[PDB]
Amino acid sequence: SRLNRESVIDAALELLNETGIDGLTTRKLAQKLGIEQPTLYWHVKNKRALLDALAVEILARHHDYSLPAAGESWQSFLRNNAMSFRRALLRYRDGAKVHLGARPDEKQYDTVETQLRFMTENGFSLRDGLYAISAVSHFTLGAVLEQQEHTNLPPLLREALQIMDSDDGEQAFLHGLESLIRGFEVQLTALLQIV
Amino acid sequence: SRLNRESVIDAALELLNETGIDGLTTRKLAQKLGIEQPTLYWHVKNKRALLDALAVEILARHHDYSLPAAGESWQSFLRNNAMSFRRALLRYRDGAKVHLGARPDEKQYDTVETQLRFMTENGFSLRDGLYAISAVSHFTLGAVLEQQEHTAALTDRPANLPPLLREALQIMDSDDGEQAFLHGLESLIRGFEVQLTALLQIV
Numbered sequence: 203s204r205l206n207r208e209s210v211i212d213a214a215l216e217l218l219n220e221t222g223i224d225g226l227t228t229r230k231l232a233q234k235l236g237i238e239q240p241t242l243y244w245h246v247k248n249k250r251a252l253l254d255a256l257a258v259e260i261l262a263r264h265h266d267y268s269l270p271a272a273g274e275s276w277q278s279f280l281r282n283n284a285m286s287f288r289r290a291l292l293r294y295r296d297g298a299k300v301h302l303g304a305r306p307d308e309k310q311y312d313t314v315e316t317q318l319r320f321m322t323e324n325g326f327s328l329r330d331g332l333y334a335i336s337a338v339s340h341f342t343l344g345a346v347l348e349q350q351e352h353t354n355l356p357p358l359l360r361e362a363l364q365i366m367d368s369d370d371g372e373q374a375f376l377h378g379l380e381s382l383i384r385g386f387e388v389q390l391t392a393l394l395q396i397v
Numbered sequence: 398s399r400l401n402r403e404s405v406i407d408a409a410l411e412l413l414n415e416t417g418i419d420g421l422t423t424r425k426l427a428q429k430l431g432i433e434q435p436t437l438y439w440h441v442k443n444k445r446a447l448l449d450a451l452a453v454e455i456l457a458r459h460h461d462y463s464l465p466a467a468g469e470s471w472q473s474f475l476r477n478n479a480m481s482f483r484r485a486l487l488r489y490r491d492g493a494k495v496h497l498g499a500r501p502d503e504k505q506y507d508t509v510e511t512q513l514r515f516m517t518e519n520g521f522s523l524r525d526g527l528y529a530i531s532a533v534s535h536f537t538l539g540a541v542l543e544q545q546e547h548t549a550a551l552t553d554r555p556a557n558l559p560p561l562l563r564e565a566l567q568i569m570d571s572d573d574g575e576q577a578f579l580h581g582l583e584s585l586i587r588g589f590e591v592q593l594t595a596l597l598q599i600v
């Protein structure tokens with residue numbers, strides 16, 4: 203079939219959903235595309251290059267709250283950004299593991315720069331804005347990964363696992379997300395006061 | 398060599414450090430131990446069973462702050478517990494990935510039950526106590542996984558930059574992620590406290 207970048211990514215994402223990250227291979231990608239491996243090699247040099255690209259394209263296609271709305275608070279931005287990031291990570295099997303494989307791509311520079319600058323324009327030092335942003339990202343990746351890799355008992359644990367199965371993990375995520383945001387606000391608002 | 402449980406695990410952890418999780422195999426374990434594959438199979442059925450066991454043993458051996466001290470605040474417990482969990486996950490190559498491959502095994506049940514009961518004995522409902530312990534777990538595992546997968550990716554290929562990102566990467570690379578971790582940990586804890594203290598008040 204067609205092997206422009208867009209069609210290769212389409213096929214890879216389809217395969218990802220079928221196999222998972224570990225079972226995804228360039229050999230199986232070649233098969234899905236109806237092509238010989240050396241043909242695929244001209245387009246995709248190895249699994250790592252493939253995964254680097256998927257990490258970028260999954261956000262490009264499906265993470266629609268990368269940027270704050272005009273006039274939006276930093277609190278509401280981190281919240282909306284985290285929900286959107288989570289949704290994008292959940293969209294494909296082992297999506298969180300696909301993301302972890304890499305740091306911001308050149309295609310993502312402008313976006314992540316704007317995110318960092320936005321936090322600084324709302325009172326954070328670059329360092330404290332970064333720590334906020336990284337905490338949200340790491341909490342969210344953790345919440346998603348635990349979901350994805352889960353794809354006699356004592357009483358509380360029993361009922362915990364009962365609770366922690368009630369939904370897909372969204373409840374514990376949203377609650378933790380609020381705790382995180384409020385903790386950041388307490389820090390920022392204290393200035394030089396002992397807090 | 399010796400193939401009691403403790404010895405198989407010792408050799409597997411040693412191998413994990415050598416190869417990382419993707420590169421660890423039962424074939425390579427057999428070689429390390431000086432035995433044939435069907436011999437190893439009697440002891441260890443497959444890679445998954447092996448990893449299950451590693452995930453448990455890594456915590457058993459190296460996660461020293463599983464339980465609160467007598468009289469300890471819930472805040473201080475979560476702090477000390479997270480620091481310990483992080484250290485244990487960082488101790489072996491791809492440790493967080495090894496951990497993620499499972500939920501509490503029987504041998505852990507009682508530790509985690511004691512953790513949940515302790516939160517409830519300090520004013521949390523089971524639900525809110527669990528959300529707290531979970532958020533700590535998720536934040537910590539995410540932070541370690543990013544650090545470890547970043548290490549792995551670098552040995553496959555090298556890593557222009559806008560100024561804040563540059564500065565942010567220089568800041569992130571200045572240690573192993575510990576500063577960012579400890580700062581985010583305090584934010585999370587204080588957020589839990591604010592929520593707990595509110596009771597039924599709008600907050």
Ligand SMILES: Cc1c2c(c(O)c3c(O)cccc13)C(=O)[C@]1(O)C(=O)C(C(N)=O)=C(O)[C@@H](N(C)C)[C@@H]1C2
Nearest residue numbers: 261268283287305306310313314335338339565566
């Ligand atoms: C600022 C930053 C970010 C990310 C990141 O990995 C990163 C890093 O690895 C080193 C230094 C800085 C950053 C994100 O992954 C990302 O997920 C992302 O790419 C991203 C994006 N592309 O829109 C985000 O939404 C951000 N958000 C989850 C807080 C976060 C931003």
Ligand SMILES: Cc1c2c(c(O)c3c(O)cccc13)C(=O)[C@]1(O)C(=O)C(C(N)=O)=C(O)[C@@H](N(C)C)[C@@H]1C2
Nearest residue numbers: 362363366463478482500501505508509530533534
């Ligand atoms: C409560 C709980 C925990 C964990 C966990 O995986 C889990 C789950 O998968 C479902 C429901 C509840 C839990 C932990 O992994 C663990 O890391 C853990 O086993 C653990 C331990 N065994 O000591 C911890 O220290 C805990 N801490 C990091 C918050 C956390 C506790």
Ligand SMILES: [Cl-]
Nearest residue numbers: 203204205206
């Ligand atoms: Cl083509």
Ligand SMILES: [Cl-]
Nearest residue numbers: 206207208209
């Ligand atoms: Cl294209």
Ligand SMILES: [Cl-]
Nearest residue numbers: 207208211259
């Ligand atoms: Cl595309």
Ligand SMILES: [Cl-]
Nearest residue numbers: 227228229249
């Ligand atoms: Cl491959």
Ligand SMILES: [Cl-]
Nearest residue numbers: 273274275278
């Ligand atoms: Cl707003």
Ligand SMILES: [Cl-]
Nearest residue numbers: 285286289290
């Ligand atoms: Cl939606």
Ligand SMILES: [Cl-]
Nearest residue numbers: 398399400401
């Ligand atoms: Cl023996």
Ligand SMILES: [Cl-]
Nearest residue numbers: 401402403404
């Ligand atoms: Cl033994």
Ligand SMILES: [Cl-]
Nearest residue numbers: 402403406454
């Ligand atoms: Cl042992």
Ligand SMILES: [Cl-]
Nearest residue numbers: 422423424444
């Ligand atoms: Cl194997």
Ligand SMILES: [Cl-]
Nearest residue numbers: 468469470473
């Ligand atoms: Cl204390």
Ligand SMILES: [Mg+2]
Nearest residue numbers: 301304305306
């Ligand atoms: Mg990232």
Ligand SMILES: [Mg+2]
Nearest residue numbers: 499500501534
């Ligand atoms: Mg766990």
